[PDB]
């Protein structure tokens with residue numbers, strides 16, 4: 191159907207045209223006339239090429255202009271908050287103020303109250319609901335994007351709890367990938383179900399093996415080696431997105447391709463890639479990317495920094511980069527389709543042994559094949575090396591996607607959520623906690639939740655014994671200072687426990703390595719991994735600082751190669767964080783501690799929230815003497831700077847490097863910066879014209 195036919199506020203229709211939309215894809219039409227316009231709940235399960243977002247926006251903005259209030263959009267990761275934030279900007283033109291919310295769990299973020307569209311992660315929104323922000327009752331609609339992640343172990347439970355809290359309290363719209371149980375998820379959400387197999391460009395799915403690609407129609411096409419599929423894509427001026435399981439593999443396979451891909455390029459093309467590779471700050475990770483890019487092939491994974499990944503996604507979408515070998519982790523960032531999508535690996539490293547890539551994911555990767563403007567047909571090829579080609583075809587192509595199961599049974603999120611229900615949503619009887627649970631997706635799918643009730647009761651004993659809660663003088667559960675505080679910090683009740691137990695020791699010896707090692711051993715941070723060749727050196731580093739650690743034993747749980755692992759992962763991480771606050775250059779940190787940019791960025795951001803929560807836990811326990819020290823450690827962790835550089839950090843575009851260049855040149859305070867001519871600041875190596883402009887602009 192056409193835009194204008196949409197019986198919605200005229201201002202929406204206008205924006206859709208100013209964009210470029212005149213008509214809707216069948217799935218969209220079906221969804222837009224499902225009843226979501228009437229404020230009804232709906233589960234839209236259609237391929238991502240089909241425009242799920244647009245449906246949500248129209249629905250959101252509509253609900254908001256016709257009934258006032260706020261529309262909450264839930265994205266999977268912080269990095270995807272920005273993309274959504276940008277593509278939602280045009281709604282400001284019609285009066286709707288848009289905002290992002292992804293961190294700072296320990297805050298009501300009341301400032302958000304003055305906004306009409308809030309883009310937050312499930313975690314951020316969970317925290318906000320815990321803090322009971324006054325603008326929450328204002329929300330008329332919440333869109334759960336990538337809602338199939340509800341069946342995801344690591345974070346699915348959180349997405350479910352926020353949903354269970356919201357059902358019947360606001361409109362709920364789910365945007366998901368094809369699954370095995372849409373009807374079930376829909377009925378739980380008491381929602382209209384929109385299932386469509388429709389997509390913009392035709393998709394051709396095939397399985398490559400021993401030198402041949404068999405498609406779903408039984409036909410065949412010769413290709414010497416799988417990589418011939420790529421060289422073939424480029425010789426036809428098309429793109430190739432190769433999916434791999436490991437970071438090093440992504441890099442190797444990219445370098446290898448590029449060697450042969452350059453010869454299929456042009457003199458102008460080579461030049462564009464050259465200037466491109468010539469625009470990257472030197473590094474062990476950037477060396478590999480550049481050398482590879484100079485051949486039209488780039489790799490993409492979580493180990494690269496935001497700049498570098500954004501640069502690959504963009505120059506790929508722009509056809510400059512001819513191919514991209516990426517890990518499916520931060521994959522989504524590549525909102526960049528491709529003529530041919532090759533799934534190189536179908537067996538990933540499980541957290542137990544070996545497992546095939548879930549069908550749902552294989553479809554999401556394949557469905558990412560075929561660019562609208564350039565292709566009339568996209569080709570998704572699954573490579574089989576061990577498996578039977580006929581079997582691979584049966585599992586993925588002809589077989590339906592796996593069914594989604596609630597992951598509420600996650601002790602981690604469940605411990606955190608049982609305490610929240612008491613510490614922030616006012617639950618005081620076990621009979622009440624099961625009433626909530628009876629309305630969850632877990633209880634929907636199940637005939638009984640008896641096993642869950644048991645977990646919950648044991649969770650209560652853990653919270654009860656660990657002073658997180660108490661059974662009042664009326665035979666009722668009521669939170670304690672430590673409990674509210676913990677639920678509000680959004681840290682896992684278990685990591686808070688770790689903080690309380692070790693508190694005495696931190697008070698006694700408040701040191702960087704000890705604190706960094708402590709938090710790096712918590713369920714709220716994913717430490718740095720290490721290779722066998724880093725162990726030896728790590729062991730020495732360890733003994734050298736054993737006296738400073740609070741958790742001084744790598745084996746209090748056993749000899750499991752995995753326990754000694756977790757502990758040294760935490761220790762290496764603490765050394766990295768030490769060099770970080772110690773102002774060691776990023777290219778140097780990456781080199782010495784054998785770690786990657788994207789990881790440093792992530793660990794640093796999390797460590798800060800953890801050093802902060804450690805400070806807030808110390809407060810609810812009386813350890814007031816380490817509170818100032820911890821706050822100064824928090825601010826140092828946040829920027830990777832020494833104590834004196836702290837006042838300069840409020841300056842725009844001023845990080846570790848520039849703050850030091852300014853301080854070492856005499857400008858130690860904001861007052862020092864103010865009483866200065868631009869000529870002076872520009873003489874300092876590292877402060878360019880754009881920085882001085884932002885700085886003086888900041889100073890009035």
Ligand SMILES: Nc1ncnc2c1ncn2[C@@H]1O[C@H](COP(=O)(O)OP(=O)(O)CP(=O)(O)O)[C@@H](O)[C@H]1O
Nearest residue numbers: 211213214215238239240241242243244335365525
């Ligand atoms: N009716 C329409 N007409 C033309 N283009 C449309 C459209 N609806 C959506 N699109 C476009 O199709 C593509 C949308 O990709 P986007 O990644 O934002 O959404 P999605 O459908 O993949 C769901 P999500 O992002 O939540 O997975 C974009 O290029 C967008 O501009």
